Amino acid sequence: IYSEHWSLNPLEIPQRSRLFSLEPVAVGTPYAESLSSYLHRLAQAHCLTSEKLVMGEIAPLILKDEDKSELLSKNLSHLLGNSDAKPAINGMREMTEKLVTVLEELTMRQDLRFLTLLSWKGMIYDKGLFRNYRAWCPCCCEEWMQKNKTIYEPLSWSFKDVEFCLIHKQRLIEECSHCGARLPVMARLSPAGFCSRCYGWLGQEIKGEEEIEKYRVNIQGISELIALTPQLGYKPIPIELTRKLQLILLVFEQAIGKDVKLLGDLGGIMESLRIASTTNQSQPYHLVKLIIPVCEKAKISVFQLFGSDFKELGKILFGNFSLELKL
Amino acid sequence: SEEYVDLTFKLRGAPIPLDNGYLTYAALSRICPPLHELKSIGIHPIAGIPTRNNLLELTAQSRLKIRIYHQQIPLIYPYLAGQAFHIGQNFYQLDIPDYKPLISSESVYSRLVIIKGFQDSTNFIEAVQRQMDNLGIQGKIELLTRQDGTPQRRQLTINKEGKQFKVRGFGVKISELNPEDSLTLQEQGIGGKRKMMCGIFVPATRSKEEEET
Amino acid sequence: STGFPLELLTRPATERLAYFENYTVAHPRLKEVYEILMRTIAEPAGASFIFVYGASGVGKTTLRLRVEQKLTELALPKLESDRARVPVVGIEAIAPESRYFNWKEYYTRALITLEEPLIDHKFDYGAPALRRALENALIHRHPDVFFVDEAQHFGKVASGYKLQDQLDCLKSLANMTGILHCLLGTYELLTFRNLSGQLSRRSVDIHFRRYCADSPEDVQAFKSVLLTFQQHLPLAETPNLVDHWEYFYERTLGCIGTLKDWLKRVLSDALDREATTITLKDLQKRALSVAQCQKMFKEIQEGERQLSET
Amino acid sequence: IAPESRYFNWKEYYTRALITLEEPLIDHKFDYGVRGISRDNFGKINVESKVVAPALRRALENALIHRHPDVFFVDEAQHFGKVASGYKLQDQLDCL
Ligand SMILES: Nc1ncnc2c1ncn2[C@@H]1O[C@H](COP(=O)(O)OP(=O)(O)OP(=O)(O)O)[C@@H](O)[C@H]1O
Ligand SMILES: [Mg+2]
């Protein structure tokens, strides 16, 4: 006879993700997808509106004590807080924190924290950093759609001090050309590249003919800041950044000691760094107001400042100011 | 001698288990990324008055001591000077560090040495002798014994991921080194798990301290 | 071993019935079709359809579950690393209450199987919304195969040309996701196999042949499966079943599943009466009606004639 | 149910099966599928005419698998034969 006896018992595979495990686009590069664009992409992949998916799954995990079905028939602002809203949701705010935590738990993904700036909480001041209204680069969207590439909004577009796309040298457009209104970042249905109000198109060959060199340092520094966070491999330590700033201050002081003229070029930044090192270290520092000009005068990229260790940073500073020190 | 330094930190906080190697190493790596990749670094056992439940009560002389090459201090000083770390749910604080030299002594001692695949005392002595020759060192090997005279083994609990692995080691006392070779021994050490809070060698008085209790 | 565990006699009747019901035997046709199906699954070779025919009771459902389980355990070592990676998906088609087959029900049931959240609410980013949701779910969840049991219910349409339009809709679902579709059904599926070049090229046909009484090798195989079923029957005494091989074949038509369920009925009847052996009248009590056997034989003969194209 | 029209009404059969099967005490809160079916103050479930028949069928499937009765009895089952299409008998039996 036949000795083979099959067994059809189930195998009990590990629990699957509640939502699709969509990869974030261009993580670690100056063109990383914003959390808002990722939310809209996940909603589009599920054939659900961002609002509807939000109260379907994120709201019960965010809003702890409510009836989930009764939450299914509300406005997005009840949990997002549209009184604030703004592209600042991409920042380091509390609702951003809990939203990122819930999203990472739902898809068991380990990179959504890089799609925002919670890794820089306590490091970079929130005020004066993010735009109040949605912005886009029409050339980017048109090129992406023509090349059959995924549409999304980079983090750089959410910053006030980023107004130009270095790829296309085009000033960011905050107003829909069709309806004339300015889109909020969060809406009931706002797929990337589309007008959240009139459903019109926002990608056109718009030419940028301004002095982009003025804002080049700011945009490149912010791009480096976004692109560097996923590559660190750890949560940054506040006093690490504080002591790097202090080391740059000491290098500045030694350079001034060697050359008196440099005091004229660096006095204001010296005073600002001294104040930032005398105030509480746990207090965040204003990114564009303090760190970017400081590393600019130090002739050091934001990537070099936040990435290199103390030895490399000290050696490069000494070489940059032609000092004879060796740490 | 002075070519290597022992970084000392006045450590205060909650009482700590007596097999706290991986706990303190992981906490330090959490608050100091560069510590996770250095090579010639090692940590001295944390002194104090022990308790009945295999825990150590930190005292005024309790301090975290780190052995490091003087050409790598600026990679560790920023992340530990004045810094604080958490071991589980316990808070620990470090003061401004002070530098201590590597002094030679006639006899040395190590609290816990582990070499892979050596559990019996005799083959452990043979392997410590082999590493002893590999360093160009001369001396005699003895194993610290309990009140019973049985060689004393110490155990390190590495709680990697969900599981935890067991590594057992011996206390090794080596005498008649000659000061140059003594310094070479204290700086190299034997066992390799110096980041794991084992392989650092100390003058022989602490051997008496550990043998009394 | 050829014998059931000997401690089962002391155990209650329910335990013996359970041991018998979760026990299944591998006869040569079933294992051959299993190897062929898994070889096609591992290497689709550009074919998006693995249509499997068979008589009612040859073991189509059992083969489906076995393939699902084995592919699941083959993929299991890597599901810990990669999530949203359902290995295989197997659902059964629903006969429509209305005259025509319903595709909204098909799409929503497929979404239910994939644990899609907020299926009812949905939206259309442009049943098109349900179809797009199913396409996206198949693309992202990345299933290896897609079994659709009872594929004869697909052609519950009064239009002869829409009969292949059902498979056209399934095919349009398949291409934009590139997921293999291995449909299983009775001989009624034969009107869907190779209609049009699209379904004639990318479809691989597997026939779950039954055990016919003409070839002596098949007769010997049927006798051997009878012998192993007798030796695996959890009774105090082993009844002689190989002798009435003609009677067992008459009411089963060679379908192994029919033999299994008939023997399960007889064993349960014996256990309820605390009997120790199986009598001929015990089999006669729960035998299938002669008219029923005639009807299924006519159906399978017509199916074999249709599939006899060379 | 013998239907007034020439077609057997499967929606009525499904809703009557659901109401007949769902008559235990109020403690069971099963939370059936589909939004159109729920309990009431008096304990008798209500189904709106808006609910489509297949969704009601799926809710009946969920209720049957949860409760798991031994046998589903249908009296005067010849009423399933009231159709207009000749082949529709096979369709009715296939649906059942
Ligand atoms: N080789 C086998 N050995 C044991 N039991 C079998 C075998 N093949 C089928 N069965 C039994 O048959 C039942 C499963 O139904 P089966 O696959 O035989 O029917 P089918 O007509 O091919 O499928 P379906 O009607 O779902 O299309 C189970 O009770 C199972 O134990
Ligand atoms: Mg079956």
mmCIF file of N, CA and C in Angstrom, chain C residues 93-181:
data_model
loop_
_atom_site.group_PDB
_atom_site.id
_atom_site.type_symbol
_atom_site.label_atom_id
_atom_site.label_comp_id
_atom_site.label_asym_id
_atom_site.label_seq_id
_atom_site.Cartn_x
_atom_site.Cartn_y
_atom_site.Cartn_z
ATOM 1 N N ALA C 93 -15.546 30.496 -5.684
ATOM 2 C CA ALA C 93 -16.537 31.277 -6.407
ATOM 3 C C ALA C 93 -17.939 30.986 -5.882
ATOM 4 N N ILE C 94 -18.802 31.993 -5.965
ATOM 5 C CA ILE C 94 -20.164 31.921 -5.450
ATOM 6 C C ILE C 94 -21.128 31.860 -6.623
ATOM 7 N N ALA C 95 -22.030 30.886 -6.595
ATOM 8 C CA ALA C 95 -23.099 30.853 -7.578
ATOM 9 C C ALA C 95 -24.023 32.048 -7.363
ATOM 10 N N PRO C 96 -24.442 32.727 -8.426
ATOM 11 C CA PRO C 96 -25.209 33.964 -8.252
ATOM 12 C C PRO C 96 -26.683 33.696 -7.996
ATOM 13 N N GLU C 97 -27.246 34.468 -7.065
ATOM 14 C CA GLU C 97 -28.685 34.411 -6.828
ATOM 15 C C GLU C 97 -29.459 34.880 -8.052
ATOM 16 N N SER C 98 -28.978 35.930 -8.711
ATOM 17 C CA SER C 98 -29.605 36.430 -9.926
ATOM 18 C C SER C 98 -29.222 35.528 -11.099
ATOM 19 N N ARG C 99 -29.710 35.867 -12.293
ATOM 20 C CA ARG C 99 -29.429 35.058 -13.473
ATOM 21 C C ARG C 99 -27.967 35.140 -13.894
ATOM 22 N N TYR C 100 -27.354 36.314 -13.780
ATOM 23 C CA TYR C 100 -25.991 36.541 -14.235
ATOM 24 C C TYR C 100 -25.024 36.532 -13.058
ATOM 25 N N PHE C 101 -23.784 36.136 -13.338
ATOM 26 C CA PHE C 101 -22.748 36.133 -12.315
ATOM 27 C C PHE C 101 -22.448 37.556 -11.856
ATOM 28 N N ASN C 102 -22.254 37.717 -10.550
ATOM 29 C CA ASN C 102 -22.017 39.020 -9.945
ATOM 30 C C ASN C 102 -20.519 39.170 -9.711
ATOM 31 N N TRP C 103 -19.949 40.265 -10.213
ATOM 32 C CA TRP C 103 -18.527 40.534 -10.055
ATOM 33 C C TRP C 103 -18.213 41.456 -8.888
ATOM 34 N N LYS C 104 -19.161 42.298 -8.475
ATOM 35 C CA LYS C 104 -18.955 43.095 -7.273
ATOM 36 C C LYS C 104 -18.769 42.195 -6.059
ATOM 37 N N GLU C 105 -19.573 41.133 -5.963
ATOM 38 C CA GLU C 105 -19.406 40.165 -4.884
ATOM 39 C C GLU C 105 -18.046 39.483 -4.959
ATOM 40 N N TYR C 106 -17.616 39.110 -6.165
ATOM 41 C CA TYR C 106 -16.307 38.486 -6.333
ATOM 42 C C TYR C 106 -15.196 39.400 -5.831
ATOM 43 N N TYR C 107 -15.220 40.665 -6.256
ATOM 44 C CA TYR C 107 -14.174 41.599 -5.857
ATOM 45 C C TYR C 107 -14.196 41.858 -4.355
ATOM 46 N N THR C 108 -15.386 42.042 -3.773
ATOM 47 C CA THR C 108 -15.435 42.341 -2.345
ATOM 48 C C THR C 108 -15.037 41.127 -1.512
ATOM 49 N N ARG C 109 -15.361 39.916 -1.973
ATOM 50 C CA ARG C 109 -14.928 38.724 -1.253
ATOM 51 C C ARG C 109 -13.419 38.548 -1.343
ATOM 52 N N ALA C 110 -12.841 38.818 -2.517
ATOM 53 C CA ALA C 110 -11.389 38.773 -2.641
ATOM 54 C C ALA C 110 -10.732 39.794 -1.721
ATOM 55 N N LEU C 111 -11.325 40.986 -1.609
ATOM 56 C CA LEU C 111 -10.801 41.988 -0.686
ATOM 57 C C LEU C 111 -10.924 41.530 0.764
ATOM 58 N N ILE C 112 -12.037 40.876 1.108
ATOM 59 C CA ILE C 112 -12.212 40.355 2.462
ATOM 60 C C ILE C 112 -11.135 39.328 2.779
ATOM 61 N N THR C 113 -10.819 38.462 1.813
ATOM 62 C CA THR C 113 -9.790 37.451 2.040
ATOM 63 C C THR C 113 -8.438 38.094 2.330
ATOM 64 N N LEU C 114 -8.099 39.162 1.611
ATOM 65 C CA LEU C 114 -6.837 39.865 1.805
ATOM 66 C C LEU C 114 -6.838 40.780 3.024
ATOM 67 N N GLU C 115 -7.871 40.716 3.867
ATOM 68 C CA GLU C 115 -7.978 41.552 5.064
ATOM 69 C C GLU C 115 -7.899 43.040 4.728
ATOM 70 N N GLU C 116 -8.526 43.435 3.627
ATOM 71 C CA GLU C 116 -8.542 44.836 3.234
ATOM 72 C C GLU C 116 -9.333 45.649 4.254
ATOM 73 N N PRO C 117 -8.785 46.743 4.772
ATOM 74 C CA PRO C 117 -9.558 47.612 5.662
ATOM 75 C C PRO C 117 -10.500 48.538 4.907
ATOM 76 N N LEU C 118 -11.659 48.776 5.527
ATOM 77 C CA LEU C 118 -12.670 49.701 5.009
ATOM 78 C C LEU C 118 -13.096 49.330 3.588
ATOM 79 N N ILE C 119 -13.524 48.079 3.417
ATOM 80 C CA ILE C 119 -13.925 47.603 2.094
ATOM 81 C C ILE C 119 -15.204 48.295 1.638
ATOM 82 N N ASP C 120 -16.197 48.375 2.526
ATOM 83 C CA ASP C 120 -17.496 48.918 2.134
ATOM 84 C C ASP C 120 -17.397 50.391 1.753
ATOM 85 N N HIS C 121 -16.633 51.174 2.512
ATOM 86 C CA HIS C 121 -16.545 52.610 2.275
ATOM 87 C C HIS C 121 -15.941 52.898 0.905
ATOM 88 N N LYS C 122 -14.656 52.577 0.742
ATOM 89 C CA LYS C 122 -13.950 52.629 -0.536
ATOM 90 C C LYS C 122 -14.016 53.995 -1.213
ATOM 91 N N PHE C 123 -13.510 54.069 -2.444
ATOM 92 C CA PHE C 123 -13.549 55.258 -3.288
ATOM 93 C C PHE C 123 -12.934 54.895 -4.632
ATOM 94 N N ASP C 124 -13.266 55.682 -5.654
ATOM 95 C CA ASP C 124 -12.712 55.518 -6.992
ATOM 96 C C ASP C 124 -11.870 56.741 -7.326
ATOM 97 N N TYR C 125 -10.566 56.531 -7.512
ATOM 98 C CA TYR C 125 -9.628 57.620 -7.787
ATOM 99 C C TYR C 125 -9.620 57.917 -9.289
ATOM 100 N N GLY C 126 -10.713 58.520 -9.744
ATOM 101 C CA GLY C 126 -10.860 58.874 -11.144
ATOM 102 C C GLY C 126 -12.092 59.713 -11.426
ATOM 103 N N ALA C 127 -18.218 47.643 -11.098
ATOM 104 C CA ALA C 127 -17.571 48.231 -9.932
ATOM 105 C C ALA C 127 -16.107 48.541 -10.222
ATOM 106 N N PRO C 128 -15.821 49.784 -10.609
ATOM 107 C CA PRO C 128 -14.438 50.151 -10.942
ATOM 108 C C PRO C 128 -13.574 50.370 -9.711
ATOM 109 N N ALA C 129 -14.150 50.960 -8.661
ATOM 110 C CA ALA C 129 -13.394 51.205 -7.437
ATOM 111 C C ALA C 129 -12.969 49.903 -6.772
ATOM 112 N N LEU C 130 -13.890 48.942 -6.668
ATOM 113 C CA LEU C 130 -13.555 47.653 -6.072
ATOM 114 C C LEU C 130 -12.506 46.922 -6.900
ATOM 115 N N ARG C 131 -12.638 46.973 -8.227
ATOM 116 C CA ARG C 131 -11.666 46.321 -9.098
ATOM 117 C C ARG C 131 -10.284 46.943 -8.946
ATOM 118 N N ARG C 132 -10.213 48.276 -8.910
ATOM 119 C CA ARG C 132 -8.931 48.949 -8.718
ATOM 120 C C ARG C 132 -8.330 48.619 -7.358
ATOM 121 N N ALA C 133 -9.167 48.561 -6.318
ATOM 122 C CA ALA C 133 -8.673 48.194 -4.996
ATOM 123 C C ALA C 133 -8.108 46.782 -4.994
ATOM 124 N N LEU C 134 -8.797 45.848 -5.653
ATOM 125 C CA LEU C 134 -8.289 44.482 -5.744
ATOM 126 C C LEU C 134 -6.972 44.434 -6.507
ATOM 127 N N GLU C 135 -6.868 45.197 -7.596
ATOM 128 C CA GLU C 135 -5.628 45.231 -8.367
ATOM 129 C C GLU C 135 -4.472 45.748 -7.521
ATOM 130 N N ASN C 136 -4.694 46.853 -6.804
ATOM 131 C CA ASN C 136 -3.640 47.413 -5.963
ATOM 132 C C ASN C 136 -3.266 46.460 -4.836
ATOM 133 N N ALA C 137 -4.261 45.806 -4.231
ATOM 134 C CA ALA C 137 -3.981 44.856 -3.162
ATOM 135 C C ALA C 137 -3.167 43.676 -3.672
ATOM 136 N N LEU C 138 -3.490 43.176 -4.865
ATOM 137 C CA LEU C 138 -2.709 42.084 -5.439
ATOM 138 C C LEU C 138 -1.295 42.536 -5.781
ATOM 139 N N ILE C 139 -1.142 43.770 -6.264
ATOM 140 C CA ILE C 139 0.187 44.273 -6.607
ATOM 141 C C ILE C 139 1.053 44.390 -5.356
ATOM 142 N N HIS C 140 0.500 44.971 -4.290
ATOM 143 C CA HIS C 140 1.308 45.276 -3.112
ATOM 144 C C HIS C 140 1.488 44.064 -2.204
ATOM 145 N N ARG C 141 0.402 43.348 -1.898
ATOM 146 C CA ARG C 141 0.502 42.191 -1.013
ATOM 147 C C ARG C 141 1.347 41.083 -1.629
ATOM 148 N N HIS C 142 1.451 41.055 -2.961
ATOM 149 C CA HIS C 142 2.331 40.158 -3.702
ATOM 150 C C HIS C 142 2.032 38.693 -3.398
ATOM 151 N N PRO C 143 0.890 38.163 -3.835
ATOM 152 C CA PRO C 143 0.626 36.734 -3.646
ATOM 153 C C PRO C 143 1.295 35.903 -4.729
ATOM 154 N N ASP C 144 1.751 34.712 -4.341
ATOM 155 C CA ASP C 144 2.407 33.831 -5.302
ATOM 156 C C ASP C 144 1.404 33.260 -6.297
ATOM 157 N N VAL C 145 0.263 32.775 -5.802
ATOM 158 C CA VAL C 145 -0.785 32.204 -6.638
ATOM 159 C C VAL C 145 -2.135 32.731 -6.170
ATOM 160 N N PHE C 146 -3.168 32.436 -6.958
ATOM 161 C CA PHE C 146 -4.546 32.827 -6.654
ATOM 162 C C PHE C 146 -5.474 31.700 -7.096
ATOM 163 N N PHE C 147 -5.820 30.815 -6.163
ATOM 164 C CA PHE C 147 -6.782 29.760 -6.444
ATOM 165 C C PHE C 147 -8.194 30.329 -6.450
ATOM 166 N N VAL C 148 -8.998 29.893 -7.411
ATOM 167 C CA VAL C 148 -10.412 30.250 -7.482
ATOM 168 C C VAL C 148 -11.175 28.939 -7.624
ATOM 169 N N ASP C 149 -11.617 28.388 -6.498
ATOM 170 C CA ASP C 149 -12.328 27.121 -6.513
ATOM 171 C C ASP C 149 -13.729 27.295 -7.093
ATOM 172 N N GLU C 150 -14.280 26.188 -7.586
ATOM 173 C CA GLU C 150 -15.609 26.150 -8.193
ATOM 174 C C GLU C 150 -15.722 27.169 -9.328
ATOM 175 N N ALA C 151 -14.819 27.031 -10.300
ATOM 176 C CA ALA C 151 -14.782 27.962 -11.421
ATOM 177 C C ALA C 151 -15.928 27.746 -12.401
ATOM 178 N N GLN C 152 -16.694 26.661 -12.253
ATOM 179 C CA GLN C 152 -17.858 26.465 -13.110
ATOM 180 C C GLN C 152 -18.911 27.539 -12.870
ATOM 181 N N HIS C 153 -18.957 28.099 -11.661
ATOM 182 C CA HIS C 153 -19.909 29.157 -11.354
ATOM 183 C C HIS C 153 -19.578 30.464 -12.060
ATOM 184 N N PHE C 154 -18.388 30.578 -12.654
ATOM 185 C CA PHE C 154 -18.049 31.779 -13.408
ATOM 186 C C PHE C 154 -18.967 31.950 -14.610
ATOM 187 N N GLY C 155 -19.289 30.853 -15.288
ATOM 188 C CA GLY C 155 -20.102 30.914 -16.484
ATOM 189 C C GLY C 155 -21.591 30.817 -16.231
ATOM 190 N N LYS C 156 -22.065 31.469 -15.176
ATOM 191 C CA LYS C 156 -23.499 31.556 -14.900
ATOM 192 C C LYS C 156 -24.091 32.788 -15.580
ATOM 193 N N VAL C 157 -23.859 32.872 -16.889
ATOM 194 C CA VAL C 157 -24.335 33.977 -17.706
ATOM 195 C C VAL C 157 -25.118 33.413 -18.883
ATOM 196 N N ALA C 158 -26.212 34.090 -19.228
ATOM 197 C CA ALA C 158 -27.062 33.663 -20.328
ATOM 198 C C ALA C 158 -26.486 34.003 -21.695
ATOM 199 N N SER C 159 -25.437 34.819 -21.753
ATOM 200 C CA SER C 159 -24.798 35.170 -23.013
ATOM 201 C C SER C 159 -23.632 34.227 -23.277
ATOM 202 N N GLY C 160 -23.653 33.579 -24.444
ATOM 203 C CA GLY C 160 -22.582 32.658 -24.784
ATOM 204 C C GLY C 160 -21.238 33.346 -24.923
ATOM 205 N N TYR C 161 -21.233 34.563 -25.468
ATOM 206 C CA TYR C 161 -19.985 35.299 -25.621
ATOM 207 C C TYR C 161 -19.514 35.921 -24.312
ATOM 208 N N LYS C 162 -20.434 36.253 -23.402
ATOM 209 C CA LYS C 162 -20.011 36.734 -22.092
ATOM 210 C C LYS C 162 -19.429 35.616 -21.238
ATOM 211 N N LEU C 163 -19.646 34.358 -21.632
ATOM 212 C CA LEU C 163 -19.020 33.232 -20.950
ATOM 213 C C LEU C 163 -17.506 33.398 -20.918
ATOM 214 N N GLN C 164 -16.913 33.746 -22.061
ATOM 215 C CA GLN C 164 -15.493 34.063 -22.097
ATOM 216 C C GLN C 164 -15.199 35.486 -21.640
ATOM 217 N N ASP C 165 -16.200 36.369 -21.606
ATOM 218 C CA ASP C 165 -15.970 37.701 -21.057
ATOM 219 C C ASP C 165 -15.753 37.668 -19.550
ATOM 220 N N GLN C 166 -16.280 36.654 -18.864
ATOM 221 C CA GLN C 166 -15.935 36.467 -17.457
ATOM 222 C C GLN C 166 -14.431 36.271 -17.292
ATOM 223 N N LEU C 167 -13.861 35.342 -18.060
ATOM 224 C CA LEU C 167 -12.417 35.164 -18.047
ATOM 225 C C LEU C 167 -11.686 36.375 -18.603
ATOM 226 N N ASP C 168 -12.322 37.156 -19.477
ATOM 227 C CA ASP C 168 -11.710 38.401 -19.931
ATOM 228 C C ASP C 168 -11.553 39.386 -18.780
ATOM 229 N N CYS C 169 -12.584 39.510 -17.941
ATOM 230 C CA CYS C 169 -12.481 40.359 -16.758
ATOM 231 C C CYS C 169 -11.412 39.840 -15.803
ATOM 232 N N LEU C 170 -11.386 38.522 -15.579
ATOM 233 C CA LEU C 170 -10.349 37.945 -14.724
ATOM 234 C C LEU C 170 -8.959 38.193 -15.303
ATOM 235 N N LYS C 171 -8.835 38.108 -16.624
ATOM 236 C CA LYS C 171 -7.557 38.280 -17.299
ATOM 237 C C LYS C 171 -7.088 39.728 -17.191
ATOM 238 N N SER C 172 -8.008 40.677 -17.374
ATOM 239 C CA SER C 172 -7.680 42.086 -17.189
ATOM 240 C C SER C 172 -7.265 42.365 -15.751
ATOM 241 N N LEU C 173 -7.889 41.676 -14.792
ATOM 242 C CA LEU C 173 -7.422 41.753 -13.411
ATOM 243 C C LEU C 173 -6.002 41.212 -13.282
ATOM 244 N N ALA C 174 -5.705 40.119 -13.986
ATOM 245 C CA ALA C 174 -4.422 39.443 -13.818
ATOM 246 C C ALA C 174 -3.265 40.254 -14.395
ATOM 247 N N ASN C 175 -3.430 40.803 -15.603
ATOM 248 C CA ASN C 175 -2.293 41.408 -16.298
ATOM 249 C C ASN C 175 -1.722 42.603 -15.544
ATOM 250 N N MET C 176 -2.581 43.502 -15.065
ATOM 251 C CA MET C 176 -2.068 44.689 -14.393
ATOM 252 C C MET C 176 -1.468 44.384 -13.026
ATOM 253 N N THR C 177 -1.628 43.160 -12.518
ATOM 254 C CA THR C 177 -0.951 42.736 -11.303
ATOM 255 C C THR C 177 0.026 41.587 -11.509
ATOM 256 N N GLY C 178 -0.082 40.841 -12.605
ATOM 257 C CA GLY C 178 0.847 39.751 -12.866
ATOM 258 C C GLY C 178 0.818 38.649 -11.828
ATOM 259 N N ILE C 179 -0.372 38.262 -11.377
ATOM 260 C CA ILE C 179 -0.542 37.236 -10.355
ATOM 261 C C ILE C 179 -1.157 36.005 -11.005
ATOM 262 N N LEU C 180 -0.556 34.846 -10.752
ATOM 263 C CA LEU C 180 -1.029 33.603 -11.345
ATOM 264 C C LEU C 180 -2.424 33.259 -10.838
ATOM 265 N N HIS C 181 -3.287 32.827 -11.755
ATOM 266 C CA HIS C 181 -4.668 32.453 -11.445
ATOM 267 C C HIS C 181 -4.867 30.993 -11.836
#
